[model samples]
Target: TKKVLIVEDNELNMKLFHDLLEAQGYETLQTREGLSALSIARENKPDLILMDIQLPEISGLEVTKWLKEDDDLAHIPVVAVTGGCEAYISKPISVVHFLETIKRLLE
Candidate 1:
């Protein structure tokens, strides 16, 4: 089974994702804070990550950059899942579109 690490602070959103992904047969792991998220990612080395952009302490972009730079975890795929419009601003792409991008990258 593939593992997915979800870094989200919202309780309701986390539950929603947990249920949705679980129903799809994907194993899920979650963290409510950014720092813990990073630690878990490094330790578990999940196949994919779903991170929220507006997180406490560190932004999702920062976490993504960090993972991309890390030799041990750089090959793992990171997916930013955010509702905030600003999260996608100035990126030349949107999260919905970025999902496809991630798919290609993971492949």
Candidate 2:
């Protein structure tokens, strides 16, 4: 089974992502902060990272850079789960796009 790490601060969104991936047979690791995400990525080395752009204590873009620089974890593709607060406030995720992206990335 493929492993996916979910980095999101919103409780509702977190559950939505977690449940969706679980239903599709992906093992998941979840975290709300960018720093914790990096640590978890180092320890767990998930197959894909579903990240929130507006993360606390360090942003997801910054965290993505760190992950890319780390030799051991650089190849893993980090998908942007949300555009940020602006997007969240005005738009909801497209389930079709989300699922397709994960499927494509996993392939």
Candidate 3:
């Protein structure tokens, strides 16, 4: 039972990610903004993070930068779950692609 933190602002998209992960037996922590994401990460310390590049309070990249600066949290991998714009993977997100990506990273 691995824990994952999802930082996404889009309500519809959030549910998709949340549901998909849960169906696969993953424990999920969700937030609609980035400002509080770091604190949540520190408190819960999830094994992986699904971060939206376009966040409400702060960008995902910015959040990732901060996380990298923290020695304790730096080892956790942050995956940028973008919406077909950013350099990472695009949406409509593929089930196979999504699952495979995290699986490899988690390994």
Candidate 4:
């Protein structure tokens, strides 16, 4: 089974993902904080990451930048997962779209 790390602060969202992915048989690691997510990524090296943009302390983009800078983790894909108004979503692009972008990047 593939391993996926999900970094989301909201309890509901975390539960939603946990239930959804677990049903699909994907191994998951959940973290509500960005720093811990980073540490876990460095330690476990999950195959993929699902990161929320509006996180405490560091933003998801910063986390993505950090992963990209690391030699060991730069190749792993980071998918942004967020929910917001269309306008706000458009300004930075939505997480669903970001997932697609990451897919293309991998190709």
Top candidate on lDDT is 3
lDDT of 2 by residue, 14-42 (tens): 99889988999999999999889889998
lDDT of 4 by residue, 1-107 (tens): 67778888989878776776666576889999988888999899887787888886678778888888889887777777652111112224444554445435333
Question: If both were scored by lDDT, which would come out higher, candidate 2 or candidate 4?
Answer: 2
In order, what is each prediction's RMSD in angstroms?
5.5, 4.0, 3.3, 5.8
Give lDDT tens digits, candidate 1, residues 1-107.
Answer: 77778888889777876776677677888998877877998888788787788787778788788777778877776666652112222133343465444445444
Q: What is the clash count of model 2?
A: 0
What TM-score, over all chains together, does every model reach? 0.75, 0.88, 0.90, 0.75
TM-score, predicted candidate 2 vs. hidden true structure: 0.88
Q: What ordering of candidates by lDDT runs from best to worst?
A: 3, 2, 4, 1
Which residue ranges in model 1 land beyond 4 Å of their true spot?
A: 83-107
Of 3 and 4, the candidate ahead on TM-score is: 3
Candidate 2 ranges with C-alpha deviation above 4 Å: 83-90
lDDT of 3 by residue, 1-107 (tens): 89988889999989998998899889999999887788999999999888898786777888888888889778888889772112255788998898778767765
Each model's lDDT: 0.69, 0.80, 0.82, 0.71
Choose 2 or 3, whichever is better by TM-score. Answer: 3
Q: Give the TM-score of candidate 3.
A: 0.90
- Candidate 4 Cα outliers beyond 4 Å, as residue runs: 83-107
Clashing pairs in 4: none
